[PDB]
Amino acid sequence: GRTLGEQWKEKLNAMGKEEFFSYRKEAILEVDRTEARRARREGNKVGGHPVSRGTAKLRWLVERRFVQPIGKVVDLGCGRGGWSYYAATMKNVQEVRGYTKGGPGHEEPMLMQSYGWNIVTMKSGVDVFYKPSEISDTLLCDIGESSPSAEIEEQRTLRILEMVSDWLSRGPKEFCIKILCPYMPKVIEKLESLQRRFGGGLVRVPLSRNSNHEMYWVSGASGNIVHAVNMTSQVLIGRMDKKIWKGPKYEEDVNLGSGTRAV
Ligand SMILES: Nc1nc2c(ncn2[C@@H]2O[C@H](COP(=O)(O)OP(=O)(O)OP(=O)(O)OCC3O[C@@H](n4cnc5c(N)ncnc54)[C@H](O)[C@@H]3O)[C@@H](O)[C@H]2O)c(=O)[nH]1
Ligand SMILES: Nc1nc2c(ncn2[C@@H]2O[C@H](COP(=O)(O)OP(=O)(O)OP(=O)(O)OCC3O[C@@H](n4cnc5c(N)ncnc54)[C@H](O)[C@@H]3O)[C@@H](O)[C@H]2O)c(=O)[nH]1
Ligand SMILES: C[S@@+](CC[C@H](N)C(=O)[O-])C[C@H]1O[C@@H](n2cnc3c(N)ncnc32)[C@H](O)[C@@H]1O
Q1: 75: which of 69, 162, 183, 243 lies 20 to 30 Å off by Cα?
Q2: Atom 34, ligand 2: residue with shortest CA distance
Q3: 75 flagged as catalytic
Q4: Where does the secretion signal sit in this chain?
Q5: Counting atoms of ligand 1 from 1, which one is nearest the CA of 82?
Q6: How far is the CA of 147 from the centre of ligand 2 (A)?
Q7: What is the crossing angle of helices 4-13 and 225-238, to 10°?
Q8: Which residue out of 75, 178, 190, 253 is catalytically annotated?
């Protein structure tokens, strides 16, 4: 046969617009960004409004001890820097280094003055697939591009998995990696291998939209991957074909404050 996630991806692509858009936000957690937008507009950089939604995503993991940034932090595919700035707010972090592709169709790093910004250093024009690995205490990675093909998503995920190992072999004991397509059998066996060597486990962040099955490979987690995935697949499938769409659960975004920090 084929995996539950496999079937999810097929059932997903067969939905109408009205159904899709309505489904992808059903029962999910969502951050209110409207004030972030206002700040952005006005150019206010010291109101603690994150640069993206991803800040709230990482916060969700961190607060549940799934990952706990420490020492030198490296954020691969940092984009605007939601994850980088958030790591810089934490007392145990001393150095935040981010890398992202930039250019056409890609998010450029964004300057904010959230608490700790001064130890953040983001660099654009960098393709992590050709960037020599560096030492780190914490390794973050949030790379992964959607596609209506699960096979595409598979190989994309596999390329990512292949490359993150090199960064991990450098001894960071705290980590968080986006697995774009975790439900595919080749991805699973690869994670099964990587889990044996590096530990950790896979976790679904409820802030992620129902239109994607992304899970995060995190060092503060553990346990059976194949079960973990399937559970998420039953939830996501369980949300389909709904009667009265209740919509998302709105939460307040994280406040990263302002000002520098001496290290
Ligand atoms: N190459 C393309 N990328 C796109 C397109 N539409 C959206 N995106 C990007 O996908 C990403 C996911 O979109 P989502 O809306 O979920 O991103 P976030 O929710 O994390 O950003 P928010 O700031 O919370 O609000 C989202 C957006 O607000 C816009 N935004 C937010 N910040 C900016 C800046 N700095 N410069 C230009 N536009 C910005 C942007 O269009 C996003 O859709 C995001 O980086 C977008 O820039 C698109 O049509 N083409
Ligand atoms: N039945 C349908 N299925 C769809 C449809 N669109 C996408 N999909 C399926 O859902 C999957 C994911 O959908 P989504 O696009 O919501 O993916 P994400 O939420 O993970 O993308 P994000 O980057 O998190 O933000 C999403 C979006 O931001 C926009 N975005 C982001 N990147 C881009 C680019 N490069 N170009 C144009 N627009 C872009 C776009 O409007 C998306 O809704 C996708 O792989 C498809 O299998 C659709 O219209 N109908
Ligand atoms: C969506 S962002 C992740 C969000 C970020 N963690 C945050 O909190 O805002 C992922 C980024 O990885 C970048 N990316 C994709 N492929 C890359 C590559 N090969 N090398 C470096 N960055 C890449 C994309 O430009 C994209 O903006």
Answers
A1: 183
A2: 105
A3: no
A4: none
A5: 20
A6: 8
A7: 30
A8: 178
Q: Is 260 annotated as a binding residue?
A: no
Q: Name the closest-CA residue to atom 47, ligand 1.
A: 107
Class of domain 1-263: alpha beta
Q: Measured between alpha carbons, how far is 154 from 187 in angstroms, rounded to an integer?
A: 7
Burial string for 134-152 (b: 16+ CB within 10 Å, else e) reads eebbbbbbbbbeeeeebee
Whole-number Å distance, alpha carbon 52 to ligand 3 midpoint, is 12
Residue 186 among the catalytic residues: no
From CA 115, how far away is CA 262, in angstroms rounded? Answer: 11
Please indicate the experimental technique that yielded this structure: X-ray
Q: Which ligand is located closest to the Cα atom of residue 13?
A: 2
190 with 13: CB under 8 angstroms? Answer: no
